């Protein structure tokens, strides 16, 4: 197997008997394909849906201690035939260091800029299951499509609505992050029927000033990580409270440090697990748009 990526070409094992994954989501792609990794990146350490699939494949979860950074000794100790990194933020040196252990399936373009469909495409190809990658993508799309046609009143409230995904901190509202269309969590919203406003363009996210906030003023609905005081807080903000979607209360707050929060960057396993919960949260927010 030949694989082209941001760092060149990778000769991969057609039948990898031992699979390691790093970064976010990559393990879910392997797992959704019936492969239990010999080790995958510990999450901030396993999400409910990742555990559910591991159990269903009669496996156990082996975790790399990837919090402070890549654990090169851990990945090496698991003895992989392939390292899945289709969605990751690896640097040129990361790729080189990792390549001394096993062939690496890196992202195609730039760090942290891989849509959930491409993540499957790269990770499945690196496992010698490119055709099965097609089916996984199709099955995942079917799950999304049948959820929206299943609840036409939620579909009706959210379709056509312009949306921005943000990271806002109540501690500091002078600066906040906007996720771009190259970000998997933002682009996922377009799979749901939402659209991007005219003020979005590259990177996966960009810092913006609250003065530049009137550029985000053409969004119908806003999504951000937060808590039960987030919306009330943003409405109280001298500048951010003047924004359309915030003023209207059309803000979808994803509870920070919950499984729902992690699923925002979608995998076929996470989508299958949290889409009802995610649509319900979006549905109510878009009611205020």
Author numbering: 40 to 83, 91 to 247, 253 to 340
What did the authors write?
To obtain sufficient iron, S. pneumoniae evolved two major highly conserved iron ABC transporters, which are termed Piu (for pneumococcal iron uptake) and Pia (for pneumococcal iron acquisition) systems, respectively. Pia system is responsible for the transport of hydroxamate siderophores such as ferrichrome and ferrioxamin B, whereas Piu system for the transport of heme from hemoglobin. The overall structure of PiaA is composed of an individual N-terminal and a C-terminal domain linked by an α-helix. The N- and C-terminal domains face each other to form a hydrophobic and plastic cleft.
The structures of Se-Met substituted apo-PiaA and ferrichrome-binding complex were subsequently solved at 2.7 Å and 2.1 Å, respectively, by molecular replacement. Each asymmetric unit of the apo-PiaA structure contains two molecules, which are quite similar to each other with an RMSD of 0.24 Å over 278 Cα atoms. Segments 1 (residues Asn84−Lys90) and 2 (residues Glu248−Glu252) at the entrance of this cleft are missing from the electron density map due to their high flexibility. Notably, Segments 1 and 2 are located at the N- and C-terminal domains, respectively, indicating the cooperativity between the two domains. Different from E. coli FhuD, the most N-terminus of apo-PiaA structure has an extended β-hairpin, which may function as a hinge to connect the N-terminal transmembrane α-helix that is inserted in the membrane of Gram-positive bacteria. Superposition of apo-PiaA and PiaA-B3P against the ferrichrome-complexed form gives an RMSD of 0.31 Å for 262 Cα atoms and 0.45 Å for 283 Cα atoms, respectively. Superposition of the complex against the apo-PiaA structure revealed that most residues in the binding cleft undergo subtle conformational changes, except for residues Asn83 and Tyr84 that locate at the invisible Segment 1 in the apo-form.
